[PDB]
Amino acid sequence: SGFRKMAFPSGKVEGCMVQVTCGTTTLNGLWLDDVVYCPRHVICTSEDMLNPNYEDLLIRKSNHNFLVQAGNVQLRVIGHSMQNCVLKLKVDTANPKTPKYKFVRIQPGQTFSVLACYNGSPSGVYQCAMRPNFTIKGSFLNGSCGSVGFNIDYDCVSFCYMHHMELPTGVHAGTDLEGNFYGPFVDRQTAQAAGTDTTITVNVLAWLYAAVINGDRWFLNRFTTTLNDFNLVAMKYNYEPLTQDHVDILGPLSAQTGIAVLDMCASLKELLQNGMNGRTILGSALLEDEFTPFDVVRQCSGVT
Amino acid sequence: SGFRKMAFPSGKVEGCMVQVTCGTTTLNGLWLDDVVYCPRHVICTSEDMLNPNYEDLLIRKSNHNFLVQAGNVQLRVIGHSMQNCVLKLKVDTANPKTPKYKFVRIQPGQTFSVLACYNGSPSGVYQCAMRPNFTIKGSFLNGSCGSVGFNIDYDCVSFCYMHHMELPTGVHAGTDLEGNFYGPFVDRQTAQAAGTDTTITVNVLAWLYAAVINGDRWFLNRFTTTLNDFNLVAMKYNYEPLTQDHVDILGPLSAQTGIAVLDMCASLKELLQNGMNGRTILGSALLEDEFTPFDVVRQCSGVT
């Protein structure tokens, strides 16, 4: 009973967080095996950020300039290298708390937990969706760079995001763990357009199934629709076009509840055209798109 | 930039979770020092739950009947006792992962993180408020009993809740770590009235301050109100009456933003009387009451 915006337990990730200082800048690093990963802008001063020549800035740095501290212990840096927008600092000690892990590049519309950190210390954990425009609407202040996003399948942490930047619009940008930015963003102090965003249709449908499973059924109607008809409505309301692949991923939820995907699409169509009429669904007064069909199945069954 | 329903990092609590089995029932236990805490209904069968005589049911149990497993290792039970609705199983080994901790009884309107667990394994973490009627709107399925709520001040975990029960209405009930239920609830399979709930006024005001700090300002108006006038509106809309003590706790947020508490009350009064007019605040289409003034200050400053 009940449905919450649930994050993964952050324990395996807390054990990997470290503080990285270079010159006067301090941010967070991710210590896995004998490598510490952090945003490459740790080597910049606030003045350098207009248009930094990272290659030139890193050439002035040596292993001993990167101060890496795991809580209270100091790590010895024996190598440094830049891969895309991340720095990899080789340390002489493998992190004893390194969990089984993978580095994954998630797709837009997928979700993940963020362990927000400051000075190498965890402050909190929250669940995010990677927007269709490759930004995340997180909660990050100065010093949060290097905080990571992740998913966990049993004992394996799949790291998918590292926080790098806040856009002038207050939304967030970052990279995969190979330092490749999601979206068109550059690690520079310049105005950067985030693309037109859309609502993640398949996630809203998955969340409508979670509502039905939990007893919120008022939005169910006597109608049905087709992919073509629904997509004309999705277009008008800036929703992602629904594909057969999206319908296929909704299969388990359609099977458990006995509500065909296109019938749930007709409920979503009516909610888009008429609003909620001052009512709520799972404690929300808007259509939630931060739960994937997998998240709904996991939460509704109790997967640990 | 940004504001999220953030939970505490759950790492220190994950290290304390164990599985407790007695007879045919399995649930979660909290292992701190050499004691494992769990709901006393672990000793019941589904048939016993109509009106269990817990004293009599526990008399038929011996130390060896409580199977306690921490992941893959088996704990040796050397004592058992019932305190209110919790069982305390003394084990021969102190948990090496026991953090600095306290047991606290939180007040209604206060918030905390829940580490949902099944079979002693963590599934996810979310932030909750203890409702004014002493229920929590969580996300719990069968097997989640024994999952705990907590807050963390630097390195100290203050355990405030242990999950025991789901009411016929789909809301949740539980105890403090001394086994005292929050609210009038009993650990029986009987219909139990949850009191009339109200919205946590001071939390909604704190969240309006968080909105202003983050740039959502459209609801700010040219009006002011008094405690008496605002409370006539709070009464009509089932909001908790605002007291000078609530105003006093809002002081830091009033000081940081320069918006007097009664002026923010006039914005809340207008939002109650007129609705959001199809707009949102911090990504919500309703008035959020699950962030305390302390939560807002902590998140807005970056406390770890």
Ligand SMILES: Cc1ccncc1NC(=O)Cc1cccc(O)c1
């Ligand atoms: C201040 C802040 C708040 C929340 N999240 C991140 C930040 N920091 C930055 O954006 C640092 C930066 C990174 C690339 C380019 C820059 O010019 C500046």
Ligand SMILES: Cc1ccncc1NC(=O)Cc1cccc(O)c1
């Ligand atoms: C099934 C479930 C779902 C979510 N949270 C908890 C539960 N379990 C219970 O309520 C067990 C119980 C506890 C006291 C009395 C009872 O009759 C039954």
